[PDB]
């Protein structure tokens, strides 16, 4: 029948949310991606509203954890059983962290019988041998040995991350089942047009210790994921031409390629932080063919 | 045309605290004044009160810190979410995303030094009922666990986690000196036999025995949707229907007023029992004197 028109939310870069961590977006970055594998499992959705990988709709439940917790005796560590069918054809529980690193946050527990509440500094290492979210359990190191009760509802809320810039590695996927392979992964992403690179929506993660690599790049904003999921407009071409427009003056600053699979590319060469007006937004104009040459932007 | 997004209750986010919604509640509201300043938005996409669009930037705090010597407390001067200054000339009650209730909010204060990349994080709390809680003047105070670590002229973020609270009592945005200004109006059922419909979450607790119930008038996703679509209200009331997608059967109906709140036909407190896959659906525009069928 008649096609539903395609659209992108009218929002500036600083009004949208990063889809790989529950923080706002900060800038637009571009750089070569051949030296590393870009395969995030969050913020993955096709343009017609089909979620991929471990991507869901709620922007708060990113890198969060929920369940019941058992103390590892002799340590300040605790094991959380996740609340989960391992049979769903997904790489890991929805919202699982899709990068290797040490995430700091708060473990909060509630005791049902009377309403007691508890909170403690927790950390989870996604590259740890005891990080098996696909199997239904993860490990947190806390600051207590007796405070968290058994089989009480416990929530992990993330905050940030803990040789300089050797951690966290954002382009290295965790092993969801352990050390002895991942399944149902979203495809890796690379620009298949000469002179084109990926355009990353970049945020700065909060740091809690040391000298961490606080850059976090996502292919699609969370608001874009929610919008694509809602509208479910079919892709009439393989790539959709988006133009960055100034709403006051109407001047176009640059144009980009929005691929139907769910990533953006620009015509540039080299690492570059895009300088844009604070009120600029992305506007959809047309569906372009496979031979479309983007006008390059400095 | 007008519409509401096809989402279940448990898939949406509370607009007064960055946490997922949990249930639907309804009850009498005569014994308290319902005037929240977050999660307020007209149906044609006009934000009211201290409401903005980011669902993660609710109850957060950004700026620079100064140490109160002899204590573990700190004083943060506020910057807008774009890292610009908070301009108190803005005809808003307080910086957008400000907590709109009295209580102690626990969280983490994180700081980064620009030159070398040193980072620190510390347990912090902010009391919205305190004398030094004056966001409208561009200043808040934080109770920390350190007296030495946080530096000056360095960007600092406060991310909330939970409470240690009077949910329906607004803070004094400029302190105990002045009154609050440009408040979103209080809502109440103006039709006989009707009650308000609250989207209810349970706030995390980190100490003590706090009352963790938090009700919002609109889910944050509804606010984003209304702001994006900008559909003009053709009537005083928008008739919504909660529908089970498996069978198509209507569970109940409710009235979405153009100012931004929902009412149901009920009498007495009740936590609504709903199917997990149900969603709200817009059907038509009806007048204010439309009698809803009783809600189970």
């Amino acid at each position, epitope marked *: 029948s008649r096609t539903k028109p395609f659209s992108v939310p009218v929002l500036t870069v600083e009004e949208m949310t990063n889809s790989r961590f529950p923080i706002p977006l900060e800038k637009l970055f571009t750089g070569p991606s051949s030296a590393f594998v870009v395969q995030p499992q969050n913020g993955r959705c*096709t*343009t*017609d*509203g*089909v*979620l*991929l990988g471990t991507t869901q709709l709620s922007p708060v439940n990113i890198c969060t954890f929920r369940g019941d917790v058992t103390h590892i005796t002799g340590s300040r560590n605790y094991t959380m059983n996740l609340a989960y069918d391992p*049979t769903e*054809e997904i790489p890991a529980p929805l919202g699982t962290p899709d990068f290797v690193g040490k995430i700091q946050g708060v473990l909060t527990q509630t005791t049902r019988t009377d309403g007691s509440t508890r909170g403690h500094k927790a950390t989870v290492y996604t590259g740890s041998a005891d990080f098996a979210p696909k199997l239904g359990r993860v490990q947190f190191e806390t600051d207590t040995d007796r405070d968290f009760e058994a089989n009480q509802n416990t929530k992990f809320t993330p905050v940030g991350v803990i040789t300089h810039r050797n951690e966290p590695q954002q382009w290295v996927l965790p092993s969801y089942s352990g050390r002895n392979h991942n399944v*149902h992964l979203a495809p890796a992403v690379a620009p298949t047009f000469p002179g084109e690179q990926l355009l990353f929506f970049r945020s700065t993660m909060p740091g809690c210790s040391g000298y961490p690599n606080m850059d976090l790049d996502c292919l699609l904003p969370q608001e874009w994921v929610q919008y694509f*999921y*809602q509208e*479910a*407009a*079919p*892709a009439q071409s393989d790539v959709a031409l988006l133009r960055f427009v100034n709403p006051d003056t109407g001047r176009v600053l640059f144009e980009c390629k929005l691929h*139907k*699979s769910g990533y953006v590319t620009v015509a540039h060469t080299g690492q570059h932080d895009l300088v844009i007006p604070p009120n600029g937004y992305f506007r959809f104009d047309s569906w372009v063919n496979q031979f479309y040459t983007l006008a390059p932007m400095g | 045309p007008f519409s509401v997004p*096809v989402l279940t209750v448990e898939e949406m986010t509370n607009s007064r605290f960055p946490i997922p919604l949990e249930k639907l509640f309804t009850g009498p509201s005569s014994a308290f004044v319902v005037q929240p300043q977050n999660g307020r938005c007209t149906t044609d996409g006009v934000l009211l009160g201290t409401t903005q669009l980011s669902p993660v930037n609710i109850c957060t705090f950004r700026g620079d810190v100064t140490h109160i010597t002899g204590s573990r407390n700190y004083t943060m001067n506020l910057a807008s979410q774009n890292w610009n200054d908070y301009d108190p000339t803005e005809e808003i009650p307080a910086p957008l995303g400000t907590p709109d209730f009295v209580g102690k909010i626990q969280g983490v204060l994180t700081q980064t030094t620009r030159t070398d990349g040193s980072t620190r994080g510390h347990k912090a709390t902010v009391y919205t009922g305190s004398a030094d809680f004056a966001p409208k003047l561009g200043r808040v105070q934080f109770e920390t666990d350190t007296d030495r670590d946080f530096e000056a002229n360095q960007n600092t973020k406060f991310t909330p986690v939970g409470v240690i609270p009077q949910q329906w009592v607004l803070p004094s945005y400029s302190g105990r000196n002045t009154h609050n200004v440009h408040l979103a109006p209080a809502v109440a059922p103006t039709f006989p036999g009707e009650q308000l419909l609250f989207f209810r979450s349970t706030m995390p607790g980190c100490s003590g025995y706090p009352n963790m119930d938090l009700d919002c008038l609109l889910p944050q996703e509804w606010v984003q949707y209304f702001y994006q679509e900008a559909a003009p209200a053709q009537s005083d009331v928008a008739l919504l229907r909660f529908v089970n*997608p498996d069978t198509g059967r209507v569970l109940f109906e409710c009235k979405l007023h153009k100012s931004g709140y929902v009412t149901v036909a009920h009498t007495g407190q009740h936590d609504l029992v709903i199917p997990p*896959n149900g*969603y709200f659906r817009f059907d038509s525009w009806v007048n204010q004197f439309y009698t809803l069928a009783p809600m189970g």
Partner: nanobody, 114 residues
């Protein structure tokens, strides 16, 4: 968003055999569940057989043993081999695709029916 094309129906008499085919058209091939259901006179829709991308099959107790579902993920095409067809099997047969989108709440996508 997703189109479905059925073929291979018809009518046999007791002891006969048939084979149904359903080809899917997606802009990007997804991980989905593809299956066959059937609807009888004055009777509601019931399951015949479903198959996933990984290969998990679920058969209805009525057709368990006689009917066989098969899948080709490269072509996104599902097949249903019906052997020992008996009068209790005369119905309209629908092909269905269910993936991780909004339409999943409402049952997914459907074919014409035979």
């Amino acid at each position: 968003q997703v189109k479905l094309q059925q073929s291979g129906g018809g009518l046999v008499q007791p002891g006969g055999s048939l084979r149904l085919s359903c080809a899917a058209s997606e802009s990007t091939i997804s991980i989905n569940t593809l299956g066959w259901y059937r609807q009888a006179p004055g009777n509601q829709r019931e399951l015949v057989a479903t198959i996933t991308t990984g290969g998990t099959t679920n058969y209805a107790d009525s057709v368990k043993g006689r009917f066989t579902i098969s899948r080709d993920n490269a072509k996104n095409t599902v097949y249903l081999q019906m052997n020992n067809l008996e009068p209790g099997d005369t119905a309209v047969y629908y092909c269905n695709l269910k993936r991780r989108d909004l339409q999943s709440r409402f049952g997914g996508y459907w074919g014409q029916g035979t």
